[PDB]
Design a protein around this nucleic acid. Sequence first.
RNA 1: UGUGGAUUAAUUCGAUGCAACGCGAAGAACCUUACCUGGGUUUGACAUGCACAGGACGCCGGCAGAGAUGUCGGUUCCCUUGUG
RNA 2: UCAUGUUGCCAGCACGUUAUGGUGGGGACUCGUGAGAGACUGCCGGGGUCAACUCGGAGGAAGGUGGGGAUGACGUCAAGUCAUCAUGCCCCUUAUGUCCAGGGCUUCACACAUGCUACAAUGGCCGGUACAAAGGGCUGCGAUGCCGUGAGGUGGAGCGAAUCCUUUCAAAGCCGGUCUCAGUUCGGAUCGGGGUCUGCAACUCGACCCCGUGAAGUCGGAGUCGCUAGUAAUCGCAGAUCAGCAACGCUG
Lengths: 210, 285, 156, 117, 60, 80
Amino acid sequence: MGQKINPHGFRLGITTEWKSRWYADKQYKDYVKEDVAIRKLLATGLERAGIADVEIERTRDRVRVDIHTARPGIVIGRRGTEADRIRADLEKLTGKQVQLNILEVKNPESQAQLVAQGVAEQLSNRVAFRRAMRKAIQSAMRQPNVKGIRVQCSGRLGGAEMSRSEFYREGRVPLHTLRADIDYGLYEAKTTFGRIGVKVWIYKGDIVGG
Amino acid sequence: MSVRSALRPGVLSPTLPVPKSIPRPEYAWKPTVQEGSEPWVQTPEVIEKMRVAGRIAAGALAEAGRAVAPGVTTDELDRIAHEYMIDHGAYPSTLGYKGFPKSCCTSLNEIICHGIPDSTVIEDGDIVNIDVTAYIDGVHGDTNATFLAGDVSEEHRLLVERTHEATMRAIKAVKPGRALSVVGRVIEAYANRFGYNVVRDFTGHGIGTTFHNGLVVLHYDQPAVETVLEPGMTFTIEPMINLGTLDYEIWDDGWTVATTDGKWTAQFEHTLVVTEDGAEILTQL
Amino acid sequence: MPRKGPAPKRPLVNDPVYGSQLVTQLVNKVLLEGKKSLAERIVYGALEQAREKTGTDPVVTLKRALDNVKPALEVRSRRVGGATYQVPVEVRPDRSTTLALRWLVNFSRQRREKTMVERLANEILDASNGLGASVKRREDTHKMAEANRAFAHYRW
Amino acid sequence: ARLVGVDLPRDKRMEIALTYIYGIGRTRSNEILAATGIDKNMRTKDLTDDQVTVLRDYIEGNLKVEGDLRREVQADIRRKIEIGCYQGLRHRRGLPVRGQRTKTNARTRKGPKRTIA
Amino acid sequence: AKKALVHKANKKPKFAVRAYTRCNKCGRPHSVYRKFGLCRICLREMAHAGELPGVQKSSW
Amino acid sequence: KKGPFVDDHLLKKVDVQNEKNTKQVIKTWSRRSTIIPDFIGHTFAVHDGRKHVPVFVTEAMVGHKLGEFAPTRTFKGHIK
RNA sequence: UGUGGAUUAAUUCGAUGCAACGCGAAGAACCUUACCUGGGUUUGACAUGCACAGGACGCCGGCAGAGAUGUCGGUUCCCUUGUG
RNA sequence: UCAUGUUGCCAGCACGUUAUGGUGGGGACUCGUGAGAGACUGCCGGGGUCAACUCGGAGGAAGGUGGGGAUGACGUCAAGUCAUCAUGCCCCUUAUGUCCAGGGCUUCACACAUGCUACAAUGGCCGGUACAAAGGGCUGCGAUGCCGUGAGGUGGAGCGAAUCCUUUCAAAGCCGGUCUCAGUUCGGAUCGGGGUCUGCAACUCGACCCCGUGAAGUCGGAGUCGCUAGUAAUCGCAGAUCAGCAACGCUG
């Protein structure tokens, strides 16, 4: 299709920041493998609860893992029952002492990935795609200081054999404009008939941030 | 003398173009016309057109043979024969026939038949079969003859001459009311006297408005064939006599063949039409 | 940038050794694409060789040769009504100078002397006197542009 | 002049006369002319018969020359065929021996590009 | 990129020359580098995500 | 050309073969040298992959290696 | 060099103007292999869950064997009494 | 422009005395990059609706979006990717599973595409002159020295590195001599010996080295492509996948 460069893949050195930050001399590949393993470990159980972000920073080789979730209580249930179990699992898997950091997103669903998560869960919930959309789309804009949205979906929508697509735009969302701060979120629901990909572009504003 | 080494499919030159003056198969036209084949029934008109085409093919074969000298490439023979037969208003039926990129077919020593002219040169002591075909007004005329290039030794001379006697012995054995296979039987008989062998695959083919009408004339004793001759069939007798066995090595040039035993072979093709009392050669000068 | 007006051109400096724009344009045209200093040396030695074989200033000799090669009418390749009708057009001084020098270089590299220094010197001489390939091509192009005057009033 | 059997042309330098030979090439021309004492710049016309004899003896004694290069190259070629080696099989099929391109290129071996139907 | 082939390349070889890359994340063995040890199709997708601390767009 | 191949399993097999002065068709998987002259007289059934095609070892057999002494590249490429 | 056509056990697969053919392939003696020939494993090379024996497995070596694989040589549990 | 002197440059200074900033010191200058300034028709004149816009001049390094990049709205062609990956569905579950042996994947009688080499004297051979930057480098640069025709062998300094290796970084170019417009000192094929290294092993199935190879091709037919300035074009260097290289490739 149209060569839409990833807004986070295009303004990663202009407006948005990297999820991970550290320095490594002749140590890059193993750090990448550790990041991939940790992100794979926190993939399904966290997304079922409504996880939003996963940052992995590196202190003096001990630990720095932050997970930003959209609902407290599931990631951290009874004190030590859930958070400590997954912390110990990370300590066993990764050859480091893991002081896992879990923080809660201050608002309801307002991230492009979060909106995609909700949309895909609704589509898997047998609800009217349209409803799901509009509903979750209304539940998308949110983002207090919100200015624009672009909700896209593709794949076997509603379980049909045709890989149909939908596009919805709201307000200013200049993708080309570099002072855009457009958050990108892609999530694929695994329906009984196949898979449905969901794209969310969230244009916060025209701020340069420089 | 020193035995010639095994041949290799040298650089094939370009194709010899053909004025549309002389027509071409329906492939040229819309593929859904399927106007080829034609009434293969051999009417006397087509008989006279066949006489003309065969005379042209024999003349081009003679030009190629007279061009044969030690040091003269088979490509030169093909060029001279093609010039002669185009000047006579004939189409090379072998040019592009199932993928044959030359106007004439040059077999050299071990090559069975339908050899591809290329940068391979003819030298002293060699034996070269030249195959020339002509097409006009919907007729096909094919004939090949083997010639002794240079002062050839006794054995290869015997080989070529024996192929030639098997040739006109199969030709003369053609009589009305006779079965087809006797032709092949006669060839095998002449092969049995000198201990020579005849390939059972590249054998005689019926010729007419189409180059290969499907009438295959086997050049060995085949009692299971009851094909009886009646006057009017134009068909090629091309008895194939080798110095070795019946297994052979198709040249890497496919069309061009060769004998596995690297032993030389010869071929003579004459197209015959059955008269009221025998055979008549329409590809003769 | 055609279709929008006249195209700006790179300015040309004069030769350091000689000091003439025609000399430098000849240098850049004899310039085999990739080397200039060696091409400059070759055109130099050619101009001195023309100097002793003429006894005059090489810049003036090159001017005389260019005048003896400069065209006046050019023929384009416009297709009019499916038929090749040649429309002669008056040549601007820069275009005529470029055509003359291009012809001079093309027929210089054609000559069969030991070096293209000698070949270019001989081409310069044969264009100055009026007995070279460039001069005869200048004659032929004018002859052909005059032979087709019936199509000359199209004014394109 | 006179040599092993490869002509030395009238307007070729001594190394240049040598370079034509199968036995001697430009680099071997320089090597031989340095070992024997003949200039790489002097012509065949300026050559001396005593120098001819000395040069011929040196090349036939210390260098693989026309005959030596033949008895090397072709004998070891047929040697690698007679051992069944696929270097020999590259030789047989008219292929470059080191297994480099035979699919379309390698015309000096198989023979120039052609055309089939 | 069969899981058997992935384990095969991950298993010890009996010769020092059998070792090759066979990018583990996806399974593509060809076009795998040393500085990252991944394939191109996964490299682009990881890089556009911003999770890599330092890679960005080049523009000079 | 520091060191050619030794055919370690084939080396032991050939040593056992010729130490007893018995000639046997060794179904030799090894295909990476015939550099060692002691192989003469041993019918190396070279495992070209399809079968074990016999190859004989000669004196001038050295200098090139064991593999396609029996060819593995069955090729006709033209009509066959 | 790659692609098409043809052999082949494979000449791996797809891509077939734009948008295939100095391509995925920024790298085929084993490997790459996806193909074939042949020899081994068969809950399997790889795993997960239920057991059931269990204190062994598993390792360091030898041998046969193309090698897979198999033979055993020697170590033989760490929990804490439920058994893991 | 400010800052900035180390590993870097070295005028203003000394010490090298050969090995060059190389060294002590030197911020002065790039350099090195942190910040900033500086093209915005900034000023003026001219048409134009008194408007855009346009032209021209001037200040300006940049002039009329400075330049080079980085910008893919809506959608477009079931193009391509179940062999990147998951994926709905079907099939085997004892095989299409599965490890290994060997081969092929490099095979070729060809068609096409793309490139290097040429087809020369602008150049070939031989020798000397001076300039690049980016780099890349820990089991990698790996030098000096040497055996070496030359691979290659040692060999490890300085080297996780503006320091040391890549040369105190080139080639083309400059010069001198030859060659004398030719199957050529073109041009490299082509293969042979022997080795040389990596590699368990280089026949398919690496490359290189000493030698030799001297073909076609004498600048390309129809027809065709690219290129608006650092552009066409030439030459050289480096980086990646690379233990060995098919790379004449790709990225610069």
